[PDB]
Every structure is written in structure tokens, then in C-alpha cells.
PDB file of N, CA and C and ligand atoms in Angstrom:
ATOM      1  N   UNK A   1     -26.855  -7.191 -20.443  1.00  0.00           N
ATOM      2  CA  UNK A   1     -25.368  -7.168 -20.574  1.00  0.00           C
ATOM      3  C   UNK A   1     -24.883  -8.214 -21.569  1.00  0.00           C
ATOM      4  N   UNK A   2     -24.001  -8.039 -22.135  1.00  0.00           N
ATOM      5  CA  UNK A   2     -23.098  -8.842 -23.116  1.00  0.00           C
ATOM      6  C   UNK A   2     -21.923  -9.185 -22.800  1.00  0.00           C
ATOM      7  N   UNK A   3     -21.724 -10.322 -22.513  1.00  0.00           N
ATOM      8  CA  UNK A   3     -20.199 -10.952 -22.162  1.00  0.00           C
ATOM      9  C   UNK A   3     -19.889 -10.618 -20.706  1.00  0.00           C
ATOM     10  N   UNK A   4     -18.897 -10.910 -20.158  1.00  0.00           N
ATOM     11  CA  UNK A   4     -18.346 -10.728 -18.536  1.00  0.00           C
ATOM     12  C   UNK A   4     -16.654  -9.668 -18.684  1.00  0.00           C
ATOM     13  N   UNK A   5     -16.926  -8.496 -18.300  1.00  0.00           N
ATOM     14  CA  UNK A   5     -15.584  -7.496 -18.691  1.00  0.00           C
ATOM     15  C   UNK A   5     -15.456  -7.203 -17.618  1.00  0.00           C
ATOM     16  N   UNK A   6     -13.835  -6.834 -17.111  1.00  0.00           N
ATOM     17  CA  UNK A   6     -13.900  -6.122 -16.148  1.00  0.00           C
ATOM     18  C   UNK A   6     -12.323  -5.337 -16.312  1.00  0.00           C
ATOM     19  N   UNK A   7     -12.267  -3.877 -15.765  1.00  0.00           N
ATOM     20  CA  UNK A   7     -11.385  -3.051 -15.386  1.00  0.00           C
ATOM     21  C   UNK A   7     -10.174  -4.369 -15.183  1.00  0.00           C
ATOM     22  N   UNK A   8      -9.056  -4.276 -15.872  1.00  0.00           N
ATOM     23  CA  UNK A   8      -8.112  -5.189 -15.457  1.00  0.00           C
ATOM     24  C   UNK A   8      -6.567  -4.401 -15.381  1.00  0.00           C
ATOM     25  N   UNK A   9      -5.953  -4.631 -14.265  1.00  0.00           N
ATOM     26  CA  UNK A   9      -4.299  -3.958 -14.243  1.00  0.00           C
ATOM     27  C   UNK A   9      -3.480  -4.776 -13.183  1.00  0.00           C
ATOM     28  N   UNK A  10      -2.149  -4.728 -13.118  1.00  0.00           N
ATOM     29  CA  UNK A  10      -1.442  -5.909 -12.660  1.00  0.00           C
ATOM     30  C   UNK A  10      -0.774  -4.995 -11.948  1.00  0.00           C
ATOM     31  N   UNK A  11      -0.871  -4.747 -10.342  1.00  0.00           N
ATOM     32  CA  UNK A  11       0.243  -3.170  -9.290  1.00  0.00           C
ATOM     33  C   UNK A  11       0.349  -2.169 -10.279  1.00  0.00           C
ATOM     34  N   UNK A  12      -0.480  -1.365 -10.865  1.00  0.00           N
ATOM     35  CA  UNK A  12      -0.727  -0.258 -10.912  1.00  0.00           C
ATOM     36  C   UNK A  12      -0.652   0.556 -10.044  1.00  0.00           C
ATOM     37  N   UNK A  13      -0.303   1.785 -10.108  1.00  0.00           N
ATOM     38  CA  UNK A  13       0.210   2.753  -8.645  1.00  0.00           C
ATOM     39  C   UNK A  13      -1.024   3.543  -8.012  1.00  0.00           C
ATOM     40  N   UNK A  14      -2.246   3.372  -8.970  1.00  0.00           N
ATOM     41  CA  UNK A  14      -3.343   4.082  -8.165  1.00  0.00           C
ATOM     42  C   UNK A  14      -4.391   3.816  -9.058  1.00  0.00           C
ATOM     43  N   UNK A  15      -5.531   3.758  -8.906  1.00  0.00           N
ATOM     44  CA  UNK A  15      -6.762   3.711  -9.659  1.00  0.00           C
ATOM     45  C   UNK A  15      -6.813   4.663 -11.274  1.00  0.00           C
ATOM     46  N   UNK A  16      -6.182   5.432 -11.027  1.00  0.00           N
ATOM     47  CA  UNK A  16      -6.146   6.033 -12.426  1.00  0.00           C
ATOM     48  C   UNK A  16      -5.389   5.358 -13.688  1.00  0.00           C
ATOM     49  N   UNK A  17      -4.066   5.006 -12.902  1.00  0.00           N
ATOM     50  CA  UNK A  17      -3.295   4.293 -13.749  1.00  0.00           C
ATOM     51  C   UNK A  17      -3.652   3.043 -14.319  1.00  0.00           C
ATOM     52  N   UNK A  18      -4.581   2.599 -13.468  1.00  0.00           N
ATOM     53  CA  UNK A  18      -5.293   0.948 -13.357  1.00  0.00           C
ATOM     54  C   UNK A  18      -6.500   1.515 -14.766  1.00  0.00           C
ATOM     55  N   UNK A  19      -6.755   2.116 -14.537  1.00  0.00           N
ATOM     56  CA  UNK A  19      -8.197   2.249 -15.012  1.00  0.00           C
ATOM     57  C   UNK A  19      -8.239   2.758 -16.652  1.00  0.00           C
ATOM     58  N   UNK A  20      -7.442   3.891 -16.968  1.00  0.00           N
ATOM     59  CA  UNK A  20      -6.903   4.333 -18.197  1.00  0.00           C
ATOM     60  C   UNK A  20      -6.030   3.588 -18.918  1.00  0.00           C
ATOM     61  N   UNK A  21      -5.381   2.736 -18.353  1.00  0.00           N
ATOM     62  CA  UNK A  21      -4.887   1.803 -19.385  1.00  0.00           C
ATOM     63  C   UNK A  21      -5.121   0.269 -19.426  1.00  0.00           C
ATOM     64  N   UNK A  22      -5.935   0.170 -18.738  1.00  0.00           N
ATOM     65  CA  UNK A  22      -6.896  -0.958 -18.819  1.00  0.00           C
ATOM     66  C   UNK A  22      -7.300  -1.508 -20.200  1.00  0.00           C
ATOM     67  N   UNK A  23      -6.885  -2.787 -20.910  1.00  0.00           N
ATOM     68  CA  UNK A  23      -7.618  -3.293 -22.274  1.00  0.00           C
ATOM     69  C   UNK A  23      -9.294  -3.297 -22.260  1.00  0.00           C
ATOM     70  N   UNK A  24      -9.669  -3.236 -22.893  1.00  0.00           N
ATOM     71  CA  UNK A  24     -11.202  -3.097 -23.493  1.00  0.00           C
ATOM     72  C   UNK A  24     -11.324  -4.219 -24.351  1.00  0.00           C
ATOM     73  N   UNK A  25     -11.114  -5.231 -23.344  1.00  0.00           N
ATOM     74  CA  UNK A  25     -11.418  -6.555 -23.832  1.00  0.00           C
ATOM     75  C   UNK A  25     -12.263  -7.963 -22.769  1.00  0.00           C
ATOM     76  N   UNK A  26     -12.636  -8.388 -23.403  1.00  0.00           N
ATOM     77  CA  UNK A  26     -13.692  -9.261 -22.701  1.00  0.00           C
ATOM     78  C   UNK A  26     -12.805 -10.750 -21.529  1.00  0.00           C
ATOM     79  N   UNK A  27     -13.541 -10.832 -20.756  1.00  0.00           N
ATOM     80  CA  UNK A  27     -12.803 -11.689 -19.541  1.00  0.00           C
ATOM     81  C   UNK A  27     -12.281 -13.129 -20.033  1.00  0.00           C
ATOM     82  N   UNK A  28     -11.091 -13.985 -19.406  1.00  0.00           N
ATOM     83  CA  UNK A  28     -10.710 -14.950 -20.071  1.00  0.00           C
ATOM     84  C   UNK A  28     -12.395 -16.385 -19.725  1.00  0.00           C
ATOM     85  N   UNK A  29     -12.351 -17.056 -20.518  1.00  0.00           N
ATOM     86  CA  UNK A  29     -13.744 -18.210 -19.838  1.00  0.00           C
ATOM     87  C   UNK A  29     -13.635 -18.420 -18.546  1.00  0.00           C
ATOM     88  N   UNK A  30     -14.848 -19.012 -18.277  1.00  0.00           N
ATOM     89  CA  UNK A  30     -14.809 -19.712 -16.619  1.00  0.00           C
ATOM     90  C   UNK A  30     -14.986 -18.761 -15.648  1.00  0.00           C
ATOM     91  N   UNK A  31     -14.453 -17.504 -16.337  1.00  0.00           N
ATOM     92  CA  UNK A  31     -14.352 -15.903 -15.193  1.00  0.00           C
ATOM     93  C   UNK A  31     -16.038 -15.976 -14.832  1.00  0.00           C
ATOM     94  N   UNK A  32     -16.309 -15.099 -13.837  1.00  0.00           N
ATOM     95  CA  UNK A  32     -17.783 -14.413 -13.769  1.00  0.00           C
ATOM     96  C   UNK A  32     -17.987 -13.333 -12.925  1.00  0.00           C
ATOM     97  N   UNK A  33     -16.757 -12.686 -12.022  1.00  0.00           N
ATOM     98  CA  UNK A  33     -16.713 -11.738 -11.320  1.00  0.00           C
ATOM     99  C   UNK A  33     -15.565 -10.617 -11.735  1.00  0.00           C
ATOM    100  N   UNK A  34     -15.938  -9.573 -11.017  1.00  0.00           N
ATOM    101  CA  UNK A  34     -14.110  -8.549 -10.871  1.00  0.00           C
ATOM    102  C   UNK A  34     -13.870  -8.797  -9.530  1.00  0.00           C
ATOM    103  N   UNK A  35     -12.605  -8.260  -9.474  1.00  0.00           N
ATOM    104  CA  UNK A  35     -12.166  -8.607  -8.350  1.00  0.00           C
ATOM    105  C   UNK A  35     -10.878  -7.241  -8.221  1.00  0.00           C
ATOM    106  N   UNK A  36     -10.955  -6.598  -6.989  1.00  0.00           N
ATOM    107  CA  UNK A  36      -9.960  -5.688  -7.036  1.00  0.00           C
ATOM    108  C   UNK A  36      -9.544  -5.751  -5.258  1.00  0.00           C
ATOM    109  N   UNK A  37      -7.940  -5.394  -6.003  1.00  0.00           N
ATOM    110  CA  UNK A  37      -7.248  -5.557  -4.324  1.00  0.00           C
ATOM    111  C   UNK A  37      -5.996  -3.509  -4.109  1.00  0.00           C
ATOM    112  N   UNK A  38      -6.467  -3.252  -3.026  1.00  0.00           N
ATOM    113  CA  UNK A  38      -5.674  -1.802  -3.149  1.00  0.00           C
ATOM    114  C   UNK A  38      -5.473  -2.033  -2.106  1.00  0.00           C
ATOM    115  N   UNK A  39      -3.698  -2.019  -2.218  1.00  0.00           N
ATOM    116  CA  UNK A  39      -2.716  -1.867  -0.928  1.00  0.00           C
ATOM    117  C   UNK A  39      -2.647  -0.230  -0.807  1.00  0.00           C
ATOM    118  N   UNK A  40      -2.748   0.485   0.193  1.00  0.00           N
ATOM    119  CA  UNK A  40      -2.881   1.829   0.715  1.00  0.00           C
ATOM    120  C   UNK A  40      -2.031   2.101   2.022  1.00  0.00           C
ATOM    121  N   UNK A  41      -1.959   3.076   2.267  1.00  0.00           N
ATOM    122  CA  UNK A  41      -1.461   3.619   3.744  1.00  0.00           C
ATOM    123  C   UNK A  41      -2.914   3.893   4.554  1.00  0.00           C
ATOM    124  N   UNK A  42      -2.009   3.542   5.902  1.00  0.00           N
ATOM    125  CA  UNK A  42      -3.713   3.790   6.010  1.00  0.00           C
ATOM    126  C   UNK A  42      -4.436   5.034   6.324  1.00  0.00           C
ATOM    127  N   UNK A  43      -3.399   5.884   6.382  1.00  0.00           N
ATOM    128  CA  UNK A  43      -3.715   7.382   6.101  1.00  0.00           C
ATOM    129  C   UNK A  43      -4.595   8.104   4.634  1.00  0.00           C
ATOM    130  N   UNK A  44      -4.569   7.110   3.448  1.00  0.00           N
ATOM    131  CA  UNK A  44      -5.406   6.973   2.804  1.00  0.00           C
ATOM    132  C   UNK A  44      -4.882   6.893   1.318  1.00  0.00           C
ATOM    133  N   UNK A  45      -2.919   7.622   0.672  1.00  0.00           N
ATOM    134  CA  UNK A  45      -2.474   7.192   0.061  1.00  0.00           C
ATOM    135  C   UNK A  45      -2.324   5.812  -0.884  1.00  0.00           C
ATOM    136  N   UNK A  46      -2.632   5.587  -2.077  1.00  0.00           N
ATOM    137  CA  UNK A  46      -2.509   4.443  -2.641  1.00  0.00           C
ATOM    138  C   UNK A  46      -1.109   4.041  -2.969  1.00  0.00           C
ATOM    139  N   UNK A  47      -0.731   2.627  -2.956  1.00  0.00           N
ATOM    140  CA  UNK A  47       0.296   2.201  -3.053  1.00  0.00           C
ATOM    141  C   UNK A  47       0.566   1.047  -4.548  1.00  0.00           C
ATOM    142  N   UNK A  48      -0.578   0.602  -4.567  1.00  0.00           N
ATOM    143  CA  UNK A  48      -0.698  -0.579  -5.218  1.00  0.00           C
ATOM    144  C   UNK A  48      -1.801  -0.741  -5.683  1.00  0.00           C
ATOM    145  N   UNK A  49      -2.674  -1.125  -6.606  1.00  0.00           N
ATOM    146  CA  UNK A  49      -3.614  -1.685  -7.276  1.00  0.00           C
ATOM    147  C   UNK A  49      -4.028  -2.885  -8.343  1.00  0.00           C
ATOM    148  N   UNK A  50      -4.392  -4.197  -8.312  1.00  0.00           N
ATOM    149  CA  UNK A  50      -4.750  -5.064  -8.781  1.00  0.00           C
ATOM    150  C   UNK A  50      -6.153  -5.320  -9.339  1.00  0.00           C
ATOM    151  N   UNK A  51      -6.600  -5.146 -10.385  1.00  0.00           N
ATOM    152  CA  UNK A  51      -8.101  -5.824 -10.800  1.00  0.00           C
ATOM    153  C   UNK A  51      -7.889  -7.048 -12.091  1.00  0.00           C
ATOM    154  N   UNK A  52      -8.971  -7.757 -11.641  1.00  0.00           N
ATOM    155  CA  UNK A  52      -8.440  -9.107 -12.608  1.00  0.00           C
ATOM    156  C   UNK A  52     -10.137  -9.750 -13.032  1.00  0.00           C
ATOM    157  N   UNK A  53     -10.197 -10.169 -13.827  1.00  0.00           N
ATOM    158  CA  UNK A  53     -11.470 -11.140 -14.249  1.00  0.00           C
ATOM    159  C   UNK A  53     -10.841 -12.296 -13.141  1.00  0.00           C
ATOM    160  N   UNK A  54     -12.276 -12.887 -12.089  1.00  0.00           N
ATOM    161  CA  UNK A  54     -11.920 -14.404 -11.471  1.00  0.00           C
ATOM    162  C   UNK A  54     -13.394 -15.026 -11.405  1.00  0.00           C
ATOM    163  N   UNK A  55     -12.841 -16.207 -11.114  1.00  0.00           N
ATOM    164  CA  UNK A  55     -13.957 -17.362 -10.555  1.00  0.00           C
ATOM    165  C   UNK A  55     -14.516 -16.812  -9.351  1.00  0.00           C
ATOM    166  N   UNK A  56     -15.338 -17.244  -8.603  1.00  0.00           N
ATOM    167  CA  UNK A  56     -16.127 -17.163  -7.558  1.00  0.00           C
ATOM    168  C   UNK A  56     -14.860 -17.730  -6.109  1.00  0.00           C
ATOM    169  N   UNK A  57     -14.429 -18.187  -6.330  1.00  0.00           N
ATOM    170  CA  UNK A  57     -13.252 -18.643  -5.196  1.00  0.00           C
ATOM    171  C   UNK A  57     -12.465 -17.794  -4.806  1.00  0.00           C
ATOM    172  N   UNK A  58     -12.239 -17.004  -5.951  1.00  0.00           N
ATOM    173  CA  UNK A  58     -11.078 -15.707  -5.471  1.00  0.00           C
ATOM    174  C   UNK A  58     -11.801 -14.513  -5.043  1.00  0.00           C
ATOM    175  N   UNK A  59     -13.084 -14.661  -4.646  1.00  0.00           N
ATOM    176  CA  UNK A  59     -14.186 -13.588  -4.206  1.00  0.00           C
ATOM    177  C   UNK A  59     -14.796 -13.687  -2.797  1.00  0.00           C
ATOM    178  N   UNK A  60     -13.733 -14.699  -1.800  1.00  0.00           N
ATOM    179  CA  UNK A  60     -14.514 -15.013  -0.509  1.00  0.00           C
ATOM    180  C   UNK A  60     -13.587 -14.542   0.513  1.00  0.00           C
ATOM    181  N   UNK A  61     -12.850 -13.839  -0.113  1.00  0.00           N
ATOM    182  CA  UNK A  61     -11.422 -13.230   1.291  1.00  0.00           C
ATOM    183  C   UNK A  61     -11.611 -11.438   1.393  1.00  0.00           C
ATOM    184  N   UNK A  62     -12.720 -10.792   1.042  1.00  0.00           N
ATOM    185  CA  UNK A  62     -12.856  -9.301   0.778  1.00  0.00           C
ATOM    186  C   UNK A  62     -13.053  -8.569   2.138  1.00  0.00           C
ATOM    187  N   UNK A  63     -12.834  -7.629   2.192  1.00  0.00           N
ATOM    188  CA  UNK A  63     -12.901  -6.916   3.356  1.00  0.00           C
ATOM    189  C   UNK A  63     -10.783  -5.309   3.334  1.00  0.00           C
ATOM    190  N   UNK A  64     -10.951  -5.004   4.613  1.00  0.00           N
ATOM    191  CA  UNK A  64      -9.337  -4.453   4.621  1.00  0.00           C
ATOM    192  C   UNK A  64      -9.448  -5.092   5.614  1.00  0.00           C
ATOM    193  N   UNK A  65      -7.815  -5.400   5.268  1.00  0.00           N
ATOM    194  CA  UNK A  65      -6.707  -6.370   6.635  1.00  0.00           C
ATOM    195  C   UNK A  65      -5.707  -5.603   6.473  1.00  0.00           C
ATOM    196  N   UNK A  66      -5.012  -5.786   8.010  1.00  0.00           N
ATOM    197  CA  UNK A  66      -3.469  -4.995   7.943  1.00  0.00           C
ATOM    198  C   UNK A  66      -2.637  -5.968   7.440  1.00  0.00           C
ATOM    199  N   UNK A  67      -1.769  -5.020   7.081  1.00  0.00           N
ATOM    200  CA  UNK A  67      -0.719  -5.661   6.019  1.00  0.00           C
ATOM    201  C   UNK A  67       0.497  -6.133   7.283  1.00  0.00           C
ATOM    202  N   UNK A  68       1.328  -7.158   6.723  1.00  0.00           N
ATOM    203  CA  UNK A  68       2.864  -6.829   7.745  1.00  0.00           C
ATOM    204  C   UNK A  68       3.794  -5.540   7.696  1.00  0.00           C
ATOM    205  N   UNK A  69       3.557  -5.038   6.331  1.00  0.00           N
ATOM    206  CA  UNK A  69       4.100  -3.850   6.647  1.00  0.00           C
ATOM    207  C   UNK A  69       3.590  -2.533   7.332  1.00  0.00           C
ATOM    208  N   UNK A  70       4.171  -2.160   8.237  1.00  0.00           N
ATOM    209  CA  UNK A  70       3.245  -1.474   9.200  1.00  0.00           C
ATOM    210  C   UNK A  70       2.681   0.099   8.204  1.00  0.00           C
ATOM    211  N   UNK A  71       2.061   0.524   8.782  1.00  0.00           N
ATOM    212  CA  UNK A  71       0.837   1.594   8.272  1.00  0.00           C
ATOM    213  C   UNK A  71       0.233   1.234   7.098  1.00  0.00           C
ATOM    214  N   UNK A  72       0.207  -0.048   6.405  1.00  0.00           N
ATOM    215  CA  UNK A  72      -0.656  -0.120   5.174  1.00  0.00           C
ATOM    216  C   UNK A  72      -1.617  -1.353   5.452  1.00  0.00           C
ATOM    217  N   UNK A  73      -2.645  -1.151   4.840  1.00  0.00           N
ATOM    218  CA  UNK A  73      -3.618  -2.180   4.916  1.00  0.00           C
ATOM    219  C   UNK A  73      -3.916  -2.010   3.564  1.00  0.00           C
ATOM    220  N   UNK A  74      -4.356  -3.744   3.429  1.00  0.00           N
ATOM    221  CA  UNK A  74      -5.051  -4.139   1.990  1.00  0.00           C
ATOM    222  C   UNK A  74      -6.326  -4.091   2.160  1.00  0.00           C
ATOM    223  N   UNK A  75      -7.226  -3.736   1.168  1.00  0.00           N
ATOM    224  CA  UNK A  75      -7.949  -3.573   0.924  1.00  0.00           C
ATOM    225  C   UNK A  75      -8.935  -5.161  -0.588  1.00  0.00           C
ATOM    226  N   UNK A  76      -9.730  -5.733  -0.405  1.00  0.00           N
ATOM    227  CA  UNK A  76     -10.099  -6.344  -1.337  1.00  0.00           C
ATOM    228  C   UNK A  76     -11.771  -6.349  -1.726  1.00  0.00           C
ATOM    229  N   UNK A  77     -12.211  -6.345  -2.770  1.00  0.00           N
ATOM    230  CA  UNK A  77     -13.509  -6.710  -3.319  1.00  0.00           C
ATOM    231  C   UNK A  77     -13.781  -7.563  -4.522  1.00  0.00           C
ATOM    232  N   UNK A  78     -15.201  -7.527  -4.543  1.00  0.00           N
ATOM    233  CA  UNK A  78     -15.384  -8.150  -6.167  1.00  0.00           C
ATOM    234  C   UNK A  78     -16.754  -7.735  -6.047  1.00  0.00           C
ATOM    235  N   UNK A  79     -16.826  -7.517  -7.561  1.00  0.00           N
ATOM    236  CA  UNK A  79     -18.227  -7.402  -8.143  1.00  0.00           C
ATOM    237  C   UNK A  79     -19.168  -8.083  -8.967  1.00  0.00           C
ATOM    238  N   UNK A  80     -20.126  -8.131  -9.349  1.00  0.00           N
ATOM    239  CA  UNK A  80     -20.873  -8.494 -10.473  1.00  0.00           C
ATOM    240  C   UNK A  80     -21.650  -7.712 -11.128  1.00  0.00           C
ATOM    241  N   UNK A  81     -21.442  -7.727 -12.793  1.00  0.00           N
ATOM    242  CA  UNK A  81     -21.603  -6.725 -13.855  1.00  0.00           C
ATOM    243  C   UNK A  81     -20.571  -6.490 -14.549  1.00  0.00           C
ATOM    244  N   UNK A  82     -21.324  -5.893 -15.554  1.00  0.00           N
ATOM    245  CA  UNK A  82     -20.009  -5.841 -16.844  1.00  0.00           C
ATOM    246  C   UNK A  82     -19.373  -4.123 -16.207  1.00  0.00           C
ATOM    247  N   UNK A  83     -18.012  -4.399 -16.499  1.00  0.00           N
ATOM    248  CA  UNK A  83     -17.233  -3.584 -15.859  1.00  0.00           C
ATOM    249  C   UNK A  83     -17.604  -2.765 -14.594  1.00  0.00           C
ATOM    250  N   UNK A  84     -18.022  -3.838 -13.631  1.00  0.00           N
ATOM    251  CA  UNK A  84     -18.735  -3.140 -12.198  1.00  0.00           C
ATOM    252  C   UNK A  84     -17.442  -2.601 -11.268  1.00  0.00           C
ATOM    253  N   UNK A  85     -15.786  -3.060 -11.914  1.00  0.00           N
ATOM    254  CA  UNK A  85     -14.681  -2.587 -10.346  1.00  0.00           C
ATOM    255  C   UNK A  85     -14.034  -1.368 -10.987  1.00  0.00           C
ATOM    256  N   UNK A  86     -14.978  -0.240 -11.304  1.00  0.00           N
ATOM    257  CA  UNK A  86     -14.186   1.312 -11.564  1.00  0.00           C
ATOM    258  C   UNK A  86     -13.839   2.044 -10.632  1.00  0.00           C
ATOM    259  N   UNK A  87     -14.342   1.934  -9.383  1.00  0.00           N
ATOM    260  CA  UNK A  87     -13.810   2.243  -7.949  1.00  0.00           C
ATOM    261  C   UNK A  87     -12.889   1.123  -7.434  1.00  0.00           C
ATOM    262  N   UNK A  88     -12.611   2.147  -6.239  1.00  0.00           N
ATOM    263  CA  UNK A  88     -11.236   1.093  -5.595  1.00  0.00           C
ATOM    264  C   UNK A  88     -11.939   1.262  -4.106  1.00  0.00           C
ATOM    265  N   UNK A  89     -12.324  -0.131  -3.423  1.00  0.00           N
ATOM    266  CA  UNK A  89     -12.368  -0.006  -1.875  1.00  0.00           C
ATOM    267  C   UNK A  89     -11.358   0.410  -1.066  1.00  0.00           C
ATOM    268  N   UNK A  90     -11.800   1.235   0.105  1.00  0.00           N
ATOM    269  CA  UNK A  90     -11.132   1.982   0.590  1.00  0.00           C
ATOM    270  C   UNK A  90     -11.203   1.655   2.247  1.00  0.00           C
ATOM    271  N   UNK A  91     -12.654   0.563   2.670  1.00  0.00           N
ATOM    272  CA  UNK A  91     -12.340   0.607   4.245  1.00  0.00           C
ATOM    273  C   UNK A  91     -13.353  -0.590   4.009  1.00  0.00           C
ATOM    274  N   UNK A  92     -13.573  -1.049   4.864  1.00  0.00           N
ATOM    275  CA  UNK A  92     -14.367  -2.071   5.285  1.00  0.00           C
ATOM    276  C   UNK A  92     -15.686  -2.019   4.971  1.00  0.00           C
ATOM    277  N   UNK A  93     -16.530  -1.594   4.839  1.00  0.00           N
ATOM    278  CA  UNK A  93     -17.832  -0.927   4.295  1.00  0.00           C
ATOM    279  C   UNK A  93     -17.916  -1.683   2.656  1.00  0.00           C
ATOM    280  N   UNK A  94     -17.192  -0.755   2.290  1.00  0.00           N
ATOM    281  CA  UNK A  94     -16.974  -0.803   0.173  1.00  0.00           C
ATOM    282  C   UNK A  94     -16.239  -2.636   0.189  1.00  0.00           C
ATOM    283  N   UNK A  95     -15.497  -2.915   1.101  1.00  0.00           N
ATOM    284  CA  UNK A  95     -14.596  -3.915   0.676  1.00  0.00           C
ATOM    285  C   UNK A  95     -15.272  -5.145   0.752  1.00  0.00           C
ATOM    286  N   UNK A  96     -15.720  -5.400   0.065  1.00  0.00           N
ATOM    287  CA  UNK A  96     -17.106  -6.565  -0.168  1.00  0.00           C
ATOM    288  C   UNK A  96     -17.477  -7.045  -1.265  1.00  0.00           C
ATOM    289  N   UNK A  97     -18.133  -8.298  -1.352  1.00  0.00           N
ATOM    290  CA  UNK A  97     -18.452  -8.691  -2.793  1.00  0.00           C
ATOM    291  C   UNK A  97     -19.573  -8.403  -2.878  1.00  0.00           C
ATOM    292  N   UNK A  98     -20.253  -7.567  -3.597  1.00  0.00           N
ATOM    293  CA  UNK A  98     -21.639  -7.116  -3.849  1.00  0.00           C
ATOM    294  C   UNK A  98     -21.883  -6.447  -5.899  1.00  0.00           C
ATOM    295  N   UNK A  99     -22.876  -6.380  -5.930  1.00  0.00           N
ATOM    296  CA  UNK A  99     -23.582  -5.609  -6.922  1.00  0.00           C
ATOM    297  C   UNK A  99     -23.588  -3.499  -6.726  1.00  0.00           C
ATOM    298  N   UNK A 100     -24.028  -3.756  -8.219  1.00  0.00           N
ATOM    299  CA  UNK A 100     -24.139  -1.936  -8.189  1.00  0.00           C
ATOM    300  C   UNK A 100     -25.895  -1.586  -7.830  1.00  0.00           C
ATOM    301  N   UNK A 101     -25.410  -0.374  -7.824  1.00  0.00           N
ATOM    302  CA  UNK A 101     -27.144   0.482  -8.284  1.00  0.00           C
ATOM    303  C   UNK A 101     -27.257   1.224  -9.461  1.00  0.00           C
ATOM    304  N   UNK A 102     -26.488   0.431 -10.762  1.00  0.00           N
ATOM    305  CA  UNK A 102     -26.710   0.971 -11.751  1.00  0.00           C
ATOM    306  C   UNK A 102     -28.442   0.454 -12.433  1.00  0.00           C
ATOM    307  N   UNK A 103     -29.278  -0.616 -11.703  1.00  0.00           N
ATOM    308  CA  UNK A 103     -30.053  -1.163 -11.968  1.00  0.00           C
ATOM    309  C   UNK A 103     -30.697  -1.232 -10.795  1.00  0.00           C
ATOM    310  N   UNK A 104     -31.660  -0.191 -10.297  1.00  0.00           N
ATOM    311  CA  UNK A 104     -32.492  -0.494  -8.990  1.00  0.00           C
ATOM    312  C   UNK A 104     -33.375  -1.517  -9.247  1.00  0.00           C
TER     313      UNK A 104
HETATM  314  C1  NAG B 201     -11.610   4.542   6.103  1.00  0.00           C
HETATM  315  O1  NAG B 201     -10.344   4.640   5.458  1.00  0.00           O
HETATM  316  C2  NAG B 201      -9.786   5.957   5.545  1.00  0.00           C
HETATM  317  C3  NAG B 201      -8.464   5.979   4.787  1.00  0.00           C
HETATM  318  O2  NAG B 201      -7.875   7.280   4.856  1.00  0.00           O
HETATM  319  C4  NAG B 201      -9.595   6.393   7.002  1.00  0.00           C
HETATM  320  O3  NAG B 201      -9.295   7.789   7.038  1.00  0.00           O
HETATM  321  C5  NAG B 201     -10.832   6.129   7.860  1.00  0.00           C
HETATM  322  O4  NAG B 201     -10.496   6.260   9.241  1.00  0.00           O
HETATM  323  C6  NAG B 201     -11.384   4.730   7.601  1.00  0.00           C
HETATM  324  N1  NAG B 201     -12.578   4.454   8.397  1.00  0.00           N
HETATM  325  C7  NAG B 201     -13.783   5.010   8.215  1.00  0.00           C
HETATM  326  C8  NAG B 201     -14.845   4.552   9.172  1.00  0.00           C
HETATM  327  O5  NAG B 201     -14.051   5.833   7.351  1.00  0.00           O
END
């Protein structure tokens, strides 16, 4: 891999929107992970979407939690790899900081 990139969008309304207009540009320094957060219903509707280049600090709160607003829960992860957050976690399982299997 070359450099540290990742899928980046600021409340985007759903993974598509996040993802297609995403810059194709390399992470600010100091970065070394992605990191993505999807506020949802929890019926399974997306509401919200965040992915950002971060440090390792902003990668230790992942999992879904309920939100205060009732029927939505957040959702958070992070990855490692060049552009590893093209999915959006969706339940507790995915919502984790881990690696791909683009490299068994
Ligand atoms: C996962 O999230 C979806 C969101 O629609 C939900 O339907 C499902 O109950 C959740 N849990 C599991 C175990 O899949």
C-alpha cells in the first residue's frame, strides 16, 4: 500500500452519498486509521453518515449504542488499509475496529 486514504464525508444521508463524492485524496499526517459512524433507525433506514481519516484514539468507542433519540442507534467503526471504510456498520458484529480479507 501507498500512503493512508480513506472514504471521507461529513452527515452524508447514506453510504452512497458518502462514498461517490468522497475526494480521492490522501489522509491529513498523524492519521493511520478510517473511522466511520452511521446514525440509522433501527429498523434499518440510514439517517446520517460520517467517515474521516483519525488517530488511534478516535478508534476505541466502536460498536452500536442507542441514541437519545428514540428508534435510532449509532453505529461506529474503524479500519486499517488504504481505503478499508466502503461499507457502513450496521449492528454490533461489523461495528468494530478490525482489518479486511482483501489479503488472507
Ligand atoms: C442488525 O441490525 C438490523 C437493522 O435493520 C436489525 O434488523 C437486526 O435486528 C440487527 N441484529 C442482528 C442480529 O442482525
Amino acid at each position: 500500500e501507498t500512503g493512508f486514504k480513506c472514504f471521507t464525508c461529513e452527515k452524508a444521508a447514506d453510504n452512497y452519498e458518502c462514498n461517490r463524492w468522497a475526494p480521492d485524496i490522501y489522509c491529513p499526517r498523524e492519521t493511520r486509521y478510517c473511522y466511520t459512524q452511521h446514525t440509522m433507525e433501527v429498523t434499518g433506514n440510514s439517517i446520517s453518515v460520517t467517515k474521516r481519516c483519525v488517530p488511534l484514539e478516535e478508534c476505541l468507542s466502536t460498536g452500536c449504542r442507542d441514541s437519545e433519540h428514540e428508534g435510532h442507534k449509532v453505529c461506529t467503526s474503524c479500519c486499517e488499509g488504504n481505503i478499508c471504510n466502503l461499507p457502513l456498520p450496521r449492528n454490533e458484529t461489523d461495528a468494530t475496529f478490525a482489518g479486511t480479507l482483501e489479503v488472507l
